[PDB]
Design a binder for this molecule. Structure first.
Ligand SMILES: COc1ccc(Cn2ccc3ccc(C(=O)NO)cc32)cc1
Ligand SMILES: [K+]
Ligand SMILES: [K+]
Ligand SMILES: [Zn+2]
Length: 396
């Protein structure tokens, strides 16, 4: 089936942060408003038998002293920090854009519980695809919070997938921001190929995913397994689609992944307050919906995850269509969405036009395309992989 992560306590935890507020709730209420929930298998967040089992699960990637620090920060916010406690938090970047707040640990752990359960649903073949709009926190590092990401649920999910059995995972990152934390976690791993398309420019967060000059792309046995495509501001649906479509198709052909994990951050939308990219949610074509439909036609068990997205109703408008599209492509069952927002709890946030379409008026890539094709051949040479060379060459 097509699965989706939610639950009554999960919704409360996803809506408890001061930066993302009730975003998760507009998303899931618009999905519900459009009668998509009965088509979907509810996947319940994972829970643990003990503190030890939780720590063992989280420290599959994060360090215990980081997890300890993050737990102490929540406790400290449920009661000012001492100077020693501020040094301690500062050594984990638990400050500035990743501050504490009374449920910071329960909030962060929630996305991990969600995305681990989603991986398990794919592994036991209960679901062909599972959606977790509560997840996607791709900037968190082993011992460092970053970009309002405290725990890296994607790393943890991918780790669970590669240890389910040669298993290969293809990770595709559509967020406006470079997926540095996931890329770093698998830098030396050939079995997890990572691919991020993003904006990169001087001073723009997080700063990686671009020239260094040359692209770094892996190390040790993981050489050539980290892929990156940085694009200039202003790019629209068609050019971003043409930019990534042949790369996606060539990655599937050569890598033949056992799973695809997609980060689908909505901050590339033309109407995001960031205002870097000009993508839409249009479905006559949205860059996002083009990519997901492409990935889904491979018929590989797939995890779709959230991410950034700071225009809350327009993130809901996008992820609702992603949700409807996944159902159409997986079950083969037409999904008819009215162009007008249905009446529901958050109906007033979709003003003043109350439509589903967002309210927007719609050489370098060929160098990167040749750059990536050589890297892909190097990867395949390094890992003794089979494929037809000019079958992938012709995709461009
Ligand atoms: C509406 O105003 C805004 C408030 C916050 C931001 C986003 N922002 C600031 C630092 C930073 C780092 C990472 C990300 C992200 O989306 N990763 O996926 C966002 C960040 C924008 C506008
Ligand atoms: K990205
Ligand atoms: K890798
Ligand atoms: Zn982002």
């Amino acid at each position: 089936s097509v699965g989706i992560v939610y639950g009554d306590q999960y919704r409360q935890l996803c809506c408890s942060s001061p930066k993302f507020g009730d975003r998760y709730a507009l998303v899931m209420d618009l999905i519900n408003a459009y009668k998509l929930i009965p088509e979907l298998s509810r996947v319940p967040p994972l829970q643990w038998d003990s503190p030890s089992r939780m720590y063992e699960a989280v420290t599959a990637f994060h360090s215990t002293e980081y997890v300890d620090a993050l737990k102490k920060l929540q406790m400290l916010h449920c009661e000012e920090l001492t100077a020693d406690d501020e040094l301690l938090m500062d050594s984990f970047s638990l400050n500035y854009d990743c501050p504490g707040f009374p449920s910071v640990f329960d909030y962060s752990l929630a996305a991990v519980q969600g995305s681990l359960a989603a991986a398990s649903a794919l592994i036991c073949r209960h679901c062909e695809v599972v959606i977790n709009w509560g997840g996607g926190w791709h900037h968190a590092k082993r011992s460092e919070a970053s970009g309002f990401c405290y725990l890296n649920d994607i790393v943890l999910a991918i780790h669970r997938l590669v240890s389910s059995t040669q298993t290969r995972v293809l990770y595709v990152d559509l967020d406006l921001h470079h997926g540095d934390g996931v890329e770093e976690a698998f830098w030396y791993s050939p079995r997890v190929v990572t691919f991020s398309v993003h904006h990169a420019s001087p001073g723009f967060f997080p700063g990686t995913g671009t020239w260094n000059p040359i692209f770094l792309n892996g190390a040790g046995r993981g050489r050539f397994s980290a892929f990156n495509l940085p694009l200039e501001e202003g790019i629209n649906d068609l050019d971003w689609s043409n930019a990534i479509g042949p790369i996606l198709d060539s990655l599937n052909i050569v890598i033949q992944p056992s799973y695809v994990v997609v980060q689908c951050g909505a901050d590339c939308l033309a109407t995001d307050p960031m205002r870097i990219f000009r993508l839409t949610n249009f479905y006559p074509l949205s860059g996002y919906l083009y990519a997901i439909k492409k990935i889904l036609s491979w018929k590989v068990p797939t995890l779709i995850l959230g991410g950034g997205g700071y225009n809350f109703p327009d993130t809901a408008r996008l992820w609702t269509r992603v949700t409807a599209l996944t159902i159409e492509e997986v079950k083969g069952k037409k999904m008819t969405i009215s162009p007008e927002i249905p009446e529901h709890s958050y109906f007033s946030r979709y003003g003043p036009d109350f439509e589903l379409d967002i309210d927007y008026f719609p050489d370098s890539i060929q160098k990167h395309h040749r750059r990536i094709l050589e890297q892909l051949r190097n990867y395949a040479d390094l890992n003794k992989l089979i494929y037809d060379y000019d079958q992938v060459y012709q995709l461009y």
